[PDB]
Amino acid sequence: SEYSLSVAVLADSEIENVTQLTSVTAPTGTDNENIQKLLADIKSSQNTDLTVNQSSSYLAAYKSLIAGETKAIVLNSVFENIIELEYPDYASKIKKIYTKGFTKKVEAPKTSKNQSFNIYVSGIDTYGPISSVSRSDVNILMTVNRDTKKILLTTTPADAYVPIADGGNNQKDKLTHAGIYGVDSSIHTLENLYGVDINYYVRLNFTSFLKMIDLLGGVDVHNDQEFSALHGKFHFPVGNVHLDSEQALGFVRERYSLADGDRDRGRNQQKVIVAILQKLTSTEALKNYSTIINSLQDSIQTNVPLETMINLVNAQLESGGNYKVNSQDLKGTGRMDLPSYAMPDSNLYVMEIDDSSLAVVKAAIQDVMEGR
Ligand SMILES: CC(C)=CCC/C(C)=C\CC/C(C)=C\CC/C(C)=C\CC/C(C)=C\CC/C(C)=C\CC/C(C)=C\CC/C(C)=C\COP(=O)(O)OP(=O)(O)O
Ligand SMILES: [Mn+2]
Numbered sequence: 001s002e003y004s005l006s007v008a009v010l011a012d013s014e015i016e017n018v019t020q021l022t023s024v025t026a027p028t029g030t031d032n033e034n035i036q037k038l039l040a041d042i043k044s045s046q047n048t049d050l051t052v053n054q055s056s057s058y059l060a061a062y063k064s065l066i067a068g069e070t071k072a073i074v075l076n077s078v079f080e081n082i083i084e085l086e087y088p089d090y091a092s093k094i095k096k097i098y099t100k101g102f103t104k105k106v107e108a109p110k111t112s113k114n115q116s117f118n119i120y121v122s123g124i125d126t127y128g129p130i131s132s133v134s135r136s137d138v139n140i141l142m143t144v145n146r147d148t149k150k151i152l153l154t155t156t157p158a159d160a161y162v163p164i165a166d167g168g169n170n171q172k173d174k175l176t177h178a179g180i181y182g183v184d185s186s187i188h189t190l191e192n193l194y195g196v197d198i199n200y201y202v203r204l205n206f207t208s209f210l211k212m213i214d215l216l217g218g219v220d221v222h223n224d225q226e227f228s229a230l231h232g233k234f235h236f237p238v239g240n241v242h243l244d245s246e247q248a249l250g251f252v253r254e255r256y257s258l259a260d261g262d263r264d265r266g267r268n269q270q271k272v273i274v275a276i277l278q279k280l281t282s283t284e285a286l287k288n289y290s291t292i293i294n295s296l297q298d299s300i301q302t303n304v305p306l307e308t309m310i311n312l313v314n315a316q317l318e319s320g321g322n323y324k325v326n327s328q329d330l331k332g333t334g335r336m337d338l339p340s341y342a343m344p345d346s347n348l349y350v351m352e353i354d355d356s357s358l359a360v361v362k363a364a365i366q367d368v369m370e371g372r
Contacts, residue, residue: 001106001182004077005038007098008065015071018042018050018098025053025061026074030169034102035074041100059083059344066093078167081133081180085343107184109303110199115147116369117199119304121273122186124179124205130299132205136179136186138252138269141198143368144323146315152368153273153327154361155266156190160330161338161350165189171341174350180342183301194362196369200304206249208299212276213245215295216285219275221251225264229254248272263329270327277323281316289313328364331357 007024009015026035035052042048053070055061058079064070066087075096083090123138141154156162158176165188167181178186187198204212213219220242228235229250236251243251252272258264279285285292289309332351340348366372 001104001184003102003104005034005100005102006075006077006096007038007042007072008075008094008096009072010065010068011093011095013071013095015097017046019046019048021048021050021072023051023053023070024072024074025055025064025070027055027057027061028052029054030057031076034076037102038074038098038100042098046098059086059342062087062090072097078181082167082177082342085180086345106303107187109305109308110197111308112197112199114369115371116143116145118143118196118365118369120187120190120198120201122179122183122201122203123209123269124203125176127206130203130205130208130301133180134205135176136183136203137176139175139186139190140269140273141190141194141196141365142273143365145368145371148368148371149321149323150368150371151277151323151325152364153270153325154194154365155270155327155329156193157262157266157330157332157351159262159334159349159351160332161335161352162189162193164341165192168341172338173341174348177340177342193358194365196362196365200308201302202304203301204299208296209249209252210245211299212296213243213248215292216276216279218242218244219248219272219279221268221271221275223271224267225259227254227257243272243275263331266329267327270325274325277325281322283317286313286317326364326368328361330354330361 007018028035039050042050055064058076061073062083065073119142121140121142122136124134125137126132126134137158139156143152156175160175161172162175163170164173164178164185166185168178168185178189183201183203187201191198223236223238223241226238234247234250252269255262255265332353334349335352336347336349338350340346
């Protein structure tokens with residue numbers, strides 16, 4: 001993955017270059033390694049020493065800049081998207097006078113040493129190209145045991161108030177914010193929360209989802225409660241329902257009108273995963289898996305190695321047999337009085353996790369992995 005650190009000043013600043021500065025404001029408490037690499041680059045290329053005015057975060061640095069409390073800040077590009085949450089116009093307020101590119105080696109997929117593996121499915125709340133940065137509102141762990149032919153779907157509510165890994169600095173915030181930092185943040189957050197290894201991920205957005213359902217010829221689910229979606233455009237009666245792509249996206253997004261709200265929305269997402277798996281495990285879809293890869297690779301990100309896809313597909317083509325699927329959801333209590341690490345100035349709704357639910361969820365993941 002590619003990112004950058006820059007020295008930024010106000011758009012109208014008389015400052016044109018780093019040699020005109022004596023200090024820069026930066027969150028060296030939390031991004032020190034990156035910040036020092038920028039400062040060494042500036043020393044190398046411009047023979048300019050800069051002292052650091054420590055800020056509590058990139059957001060705090062940005063606030064000090066616009067307030068005119070500092071002349072210049074360091075900005076790590078990843079955090080631009082975090083700043084944007086409180087300051088949507090931030091890009092228009094600043095100019096960049098020095099830029100350094102950075103590359104982080106992606107954490108490899110982990111091959112399980114047994115019959116079970118965990119795949120994290122992250123669903124990003126935007127239309128458009130897959131590289132579009134947004135929140136991760138779908139966060140479903142799929143625990144698969146090829147020996148017992150069981151799958152467990154664990155849904156963690158988007159609003160779940162948990163320590164956010166990496167860019168989140170392990171501070172508590174809504175899980176969905178982890179998606180802004182990147183898929184590695186979401187993965188590590190859930191690995192930390194459930195105490196399990198996540199072998200692979202799949203990341204997709206609204207546009208990705210539509211393309212996938214189109215390719216599979218829609219999906220078939222059993223709907224448990226009458227509801228409508230997307231400003232009353234779609235109406236879903238009780239019973240068996242065929243969902244084309246737009247219908248399916250409405251089906252997985254609606255929560256307010258459901259009897260159990262977001263928990264029911266979580267259950268509808270789980271129904272749709274099962275329905276997708278049923279399409280993906282048809283003889284034709286398996287035989288044609290390479291065409292599916294070709295058709296969706298520009299819109300769906302995954303680190304499942306090709307080799308592994310081939311093994312999973314071919315084992316299934318040879319053996320047949322359906323996976324029995326069970327589902328569970330992490331429970332808690334909605335609150336509006338807890339601080340968001342990403343958005344400290346805003347009152348947000350979060351779900352404080354129930355301890356006993358966490359224990360149950362963890363135990364069920366372990367059981368399925370071990371074949372209990
Ligand atoms: C068959 C094969 C390949 C192998 C053999 C099978 C085998 C042996 C194993 C199976 C495992 C493998 C390797 C492959 C199979 C493929 C898998 C595992 C899954 C496919 C399913 C998938 C990729 C996605 C389904 C995700 C889903 C239910 C929804 C995603 C929709 C999105 C992007 C967003 C919605 C966000 C929401 C709810 C609100 C935002 O909306 P908004 O922001 O407006 O609302 P607000 O925020 O305000 O609420
Ligand atoms: Mn959303």
